[PDB]
Design an enzyme around this catalytic site. Structure first.
Site, PDB file in Angstrom:
ATOM      1  N   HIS A 149      15.041  37.682  67.278  1.00 20.26           N
ATOM      2  CA  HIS A 149      16.371  37.892  67.843  1.00 20.26           C
ATOM      3  C   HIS A 149      16.834  36.699  68.670  1.00 20.26           C
ATOM      4  CE1 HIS A 149      19.700  39.372  70.211  1.00 20.26           C
ATOM      5  NE2 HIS A 149      19.005  39.088  71.298  1.00 20.26           N
ATOM      6  N   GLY A 185      15.481  11.808  78.858  1.00 16.14           N
ATOM      7  CA  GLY A 185      15.292  11.770  80.294  1.00 16.14           C
ATOM      8  C   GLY A 185      16.163  12.708  81.094  1.00 16.14           C
ATOM      9  N   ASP A 209       8.970  14.334  66.775  1.00 20.94           N
ATOM     10  CA  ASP A 209       9.025  13.397  67.883  1.00 20.94           C
ATOM     11  C   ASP A 209       8.121  12.197  67.607  1.00 20.94           C
ATOM     12  OD1 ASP A 209       7.180  15.668  68.139  1.00 20.94           O
ATOM     13  OD2 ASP A 209       6.379  14.561  69.856  1.00 20.94           O
ATOM     14  N   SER A 210       8.234  11.184  68.468  1.00 19.15           N
ATOM     15  CA  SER A 210       7.399   9.997  68.336  1.00 19.15           C
ATOM     16  C   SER A 210       5.927  10.289  68.583  1.00 19.15           C
ATOM     17  CB  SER A 210       7.865   8.918  69.306  1.00 19.15           C
ATOM     18  OG  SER A 210       7.634   9.316  70.647  1.00 19.15           O
ATOM     19  N   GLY A 211       5.617  11.337  69.340  1.00 16.21           N
ATOM     20  CA  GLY A 211       4.253  11.642  69.702  1.00 16.21           C
ATOM     21  C   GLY A 211       3.782  11.030  71.002  1.00 16.21           C
ATOM     22  N   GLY A 212       4.687  10.479  71.808  1.00 17.87           N
ATOM     23  CA  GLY A 212       4.301   9.814  73.035  1.00 17.87           C
ATOM     24  C   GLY A 212       4.177  10.741  74.226  1.00 17.87           C
ATOM     25  N   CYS A 257      18.130  43.631  65.619  1.00 20.97           N
ATOM     26  CA  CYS A 257      19.317  44.354  66.061  1.00 20.97           C
ATOM     27  C   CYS A 257      19.931  45.218  64.972  1.00 20.97           C
ATOM     28  CB  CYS A 257      20.367  43.376  66.583  1.00 20.97           C
ATOM     29  SG  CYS A 257      19.856  42.511  68.056  1.00 20.97           S
ATOM     30  N   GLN A 305      17.523   5.762  77.434  1.00 25.52           N
ATOM     31  CA  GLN A 305      16.760   5.883  78.664  1.00 25.52           C
ATOM     32  C   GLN A 305      17.668   5.561  79.855  1.00 25.52           C
ATOM     33  OE1 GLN A 305      13.968   7.325  78.237  1.00 25.52           O
ATOM     34  NE2 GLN A 305      13.819   7.052  76.011  1.00 25.52           N
ATOM     35  N   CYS A 360      24.804  41.383  66.871  1.00 23.80           N
ATOM     36  CA  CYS A 360      23.834  40.411  66.386  1.00 23.80           C
ATOM     37  C   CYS A 360      23.386  40.788  64.978  1.00 23.80           C
ATOM     38  CB  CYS A 360      22.635  40.343  67.319  1.00 23.80           C
ATOM     39  SG  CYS A 360      21.350  39.198  66.807  1.00 23.80           S
ATOM     40  N   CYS A 408      20.663  39.809  63.350  1.00 21.21           N
ATOM     41  CA  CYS A 408      19.244  39.617  63.103  1.00 21.21           C
ATOM     42  C   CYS A 408      18.579  40.931  62.687  1.00 21.21           C
ATOM     43  CB  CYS A 408      18.565  39.052  64.347  1.00 21.21           C
ATOM     44  SG  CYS A 408      17.910  40.283  65.480  1.00 21.21           S
TER      45      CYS A 408
HETATM   46 ZN   LIG Z   1      19.417  40.376  67.312  1.00 23.42          ZN
END
Ligand SMILES: [Zn+2]
Ligand SMILES: [Zn+2]
Lengths: 382, 379
Positions: B325, B206, B92-95, B299, B179, B294, B296
């Site tokens: 997961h 926004g 991100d811009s850091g703002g 799972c 914006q 799933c 992962c």
């Molecule tokens: Zn999973």
């Protein structure tokens, strides 16, 4: 447990325990250490990260103090604790107490012993204890025992004598219950040598327990802050001199490298690996060297120190663990300052791998009859 | 020099199956982008995140500005080399107390002390030191009156200043941020002004401020209708499974949210029926996996009952299993969305997703039924 010794150099037993497990197709090298777990899991490490570590022991330590409160769940599960926690391939020795968070003393009677878990206290009679081992179905399990005669406070001779009689009464009760269950007979009971700091009771516990058909022995009550005292080191020698050579010797609360080598000289085979866990919890990494052919201890560095904020070297040059092959001290230092859990993960991977490689050097040194050089190298680093 | 290739489109709605060509590899779109800063804080290594199929994640510019600072990140060969992440990164811009002037965003020091000015130029310089593959413009984000329009035009002027300061468009991709808030006239103005700039990508800003869902999806559809078709559309701060499916139908390509990492700490695991609150009693004896579909590691290995046990213990691994997961659920959902677009079955996919999530169509959220109907997807 068919134990086979290669040799005994200066009192150190080099060998291997064959035909272990449900299929009997597992072996364990001695001297060695067990994988340390908490609620059936290696700390900070899932089964996925655990595979990223070289030299993980084949037998893992479980603690009743972390699993007793899950007795009803595992009873309904029926298939055993190793399958329940997703480690069906490993061996499991269930001990009574956790070595780092054991809980308070004063709950041992001749009728029940208490352990302490996240949910609270669990009181176990011999019936309740064997009912819990039936649901866990561990390969080995420490028999219910009285080890609170060995304490820092002024202990009495009558109390040391009681711990021997109480643990034996517990042992004989568990053996009668074991032979009355099909499931429980597949497991191996480990006798527990008690007796406090009284020599006559220590020797009496070792002789009387060895008379029972236990598969091994747990040497209980030899822990020491900062390490095993000279008095208890001598007690340990006299005990192991009374035990068969054909059965394994386990010890609890002795994991620091200096006292491990001290207890191997006394004939102790198997150790807990909770010391690398303690190093991780204080944000440190073991850096002590064990190459013999060329709250924080001196074996480690504290990565919260500002000198590592720009240090882009690994924790240990030449280490083959996941953390040292992929990350830097500066990254570990940053994770600790921002209180990120990846620090505990990366530190534990290195500290386990470094610790397990230390136990390879012990077995290598016993092959070459050079444990003296290894012990002096470890001790010269305090 | 387009960074996005369109592979397939839904013949009925606005769904787009695409692909991003970035310096650290190509990314299939639509893509949910985890916040890697929170993943490492969750205890997930680079290898795990890679094994889940993630090829792009976020880094927080403001956090890295506080620790360890951009000077160290530069010495560490950028953010890629620091955390050892081999794939793509977005910062991100850091703002986003912080006062805003034409010079930039002002940060006060705690208990008095020198301020710190984050200008559009310094945002580009900080993000250039991080080395991310996609960088975000500095914008003037307001919380309603004259300040909304004032901040939109400043976001445009700040966009031109970021474009001027960004001297290496071949190595980092600068995104504009639309914006206008929920004001259609302002947002349309910002869409007209910002699309004239030659930036490789566009983000919709926004739209995670607590507004109504009707005003939410309508501002999304207004944005996607005026954003270039041959550049990616980035909807920031959207992570709920329903919102992703709906906003893909509205034409969005990229998404980010701390949601999957957050609820993993709360014991909740994402499933096609919503979530499982694995800390609760009802899962103490549930010996099935979270989701047998799933892929992962959690799972494929563990049961709900075992995770329930870890949640009632001091084991930090309880959070690692769920963080693994939940990220995998987000990736699985967006790849299943992408396959439906490739196979020209996206509306049938949406109808099945909504049916599994809510049951009878009358129980679907009213805003989602309207948004999907606006692009020809009926339930
Ligand atoms: Zn999973
Ligand atoms: Zn290492």
């Amino acid at each position: 447990p068919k134990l086979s010794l290669i040799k005994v150099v200066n009192g150190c037993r080099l060998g291997k325990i064959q035909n272990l497990g449900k299929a009997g197709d597992c072996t364990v090298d001695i001297p060695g250490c067990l994988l340390y777990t908490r609620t059936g899991s290696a700390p900070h490490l899932t089964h996925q990260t655990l595979r990223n570590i070289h030299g993980v022991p084949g037998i893992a330590q479980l603690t009743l103090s972390s699993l007793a409160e899950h007795h009803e769940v595992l009873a309904e599960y029926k298939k055993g604790v190793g399958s329940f926690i997703g480690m069906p391939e490993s061996l499991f020795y269930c001990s009574l107490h956790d070595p780092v968070t054991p809980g308070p003393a004063g709950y041992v009677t001749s009728k029940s012993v208490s352990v302490w878990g996240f949910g609270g206290r669990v009181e176990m009679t011999v019936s309740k204890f064997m009912a819990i081992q039936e649901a866990l179905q561990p390969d080995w399990f420490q028999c219910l025992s009285d080890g609170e005669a060995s304490c820092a406070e002024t202990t009495s001779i009558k109390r040391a004598r009681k711990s021997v009689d109480r643990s034996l009464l517990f042992l004989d009760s568990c053996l009668r219950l074991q032979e009355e269950s099909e499931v429980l007979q597949k497991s191996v009971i480990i006798g527990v040598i008690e007796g406090g700091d009284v020599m006559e009771e220590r020797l009496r516990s070792a002789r009387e327990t060895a008379k029972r058909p236990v598969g091994g022995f747990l040497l209980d009550g030899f822990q020491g802050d900062p390490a095993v005292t000279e008095t208890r080191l001598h007690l340990l020698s006299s005990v192991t001199a009374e035990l068969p050579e054909d059965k394994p010797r386990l010890i609890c609360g002795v994991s620091r490298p200096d006292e491990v080598l001290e207890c191997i000289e006394r004939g102790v085979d198997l150790f807990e690996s909770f010391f690398p866990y303690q190093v991780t919890e204080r944000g440190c990494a073991l850096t002590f060297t064990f190459d013999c052919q060329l709250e924080m201890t001196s074996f480690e560095i504290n990565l919260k120190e500002k000198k590592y904020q720009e240090d882009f070297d690994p924790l240990v040059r030449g280490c083959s663990c996941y953390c040292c092959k992929n990350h830097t001290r500066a990254y570990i230092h940053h994770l600790l300052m921002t209180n990120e859990l990846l620090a505990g993960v990366l530190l534990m991977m290195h500290n386990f791998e470094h610790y397990f490689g230390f136990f390879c050097s012990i077995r290598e040194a016993l092959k070459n009859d050079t444990l003296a050089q290894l012990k002096e190298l470890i001790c010269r680093q305090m | 020099p387009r960074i996005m290739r369109l592979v397939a489109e839904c013949s009925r709605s606005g769904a787009r199956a695409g692909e991003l060509r970035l310096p650290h590899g190509t990314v299939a779109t639509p893509v949910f982008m985890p916040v890697g800063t929170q993943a490492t804080m969750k205890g997930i290594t680079t290898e795990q995140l890679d094994s889940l199929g993630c090829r792009i994640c976020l880094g927080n510019t403001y956090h890295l500005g506080l620790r360890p600072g951009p000077e160290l990140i530069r010495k560490a060969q950028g953010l890629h080399g620091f955390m050892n992440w081999p794939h793509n990164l977005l910062t991100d811009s850091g703002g986003f107390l912080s006062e805003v002037t034409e010079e930039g965003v002002h940060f006060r020091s705690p208990y008095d002390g020198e301020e710190t000015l984050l200008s559009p130029e310094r945002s580009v310089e900080i993000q250039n030191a991080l080395g991310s593959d996609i960088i975000m413009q500095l914008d003037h984000v307001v919380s309603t009156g004259p300040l909304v329009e004032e901040a939109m035009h400043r976001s445009v002027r700040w966009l031109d200043r970021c474009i001027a300061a960004h001297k290496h468009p071949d190595k980092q991709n600068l995104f504009a941020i639309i914006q206008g808030g929920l004001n259609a006239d302002l947002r349309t103005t910002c869409l007209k002004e910002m699309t004239k700039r030659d930036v490789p990508g566009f983000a919709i800003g926004g739209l995670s401020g607590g507004e109504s869902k009707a005003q939410f999806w309508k501002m999304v559809a207004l944005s996607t209708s005026m954003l270039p078709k041959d550049k990616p559309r980035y909807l920031m701060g959207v992570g709920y499974a329903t919102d992703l499916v709906v906003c893909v139908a509205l034409g969005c390509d990229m998404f980010d949210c701390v949601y999957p990492t957050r609820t993993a700490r709360f014991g909740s695991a994402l499933v096609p029926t919503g979530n499982l609150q694995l800390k609760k009693k009802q899962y103490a004896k549930d010996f099935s996996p979270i989701n047998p579909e799933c892929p992962c590691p959690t799972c494929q290995t563990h049961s709900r009952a075992f995770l329930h046990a870890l949640l009632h213990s001091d084991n930090t691994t309880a959070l690692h299993h769920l963080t693994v997961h939940n990220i995998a659920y987000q990736l699985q959902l967006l790849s299943a969305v992408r396959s439906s677009i490739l196979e020209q079955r996206f509306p049938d996919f949406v109808r099945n997703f909504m049916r599994t999530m809510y049951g009878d169509h009358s129980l679907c959220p009213a805003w989602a039924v309207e948004a999907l109907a606006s692009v020809g997807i009926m339930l």
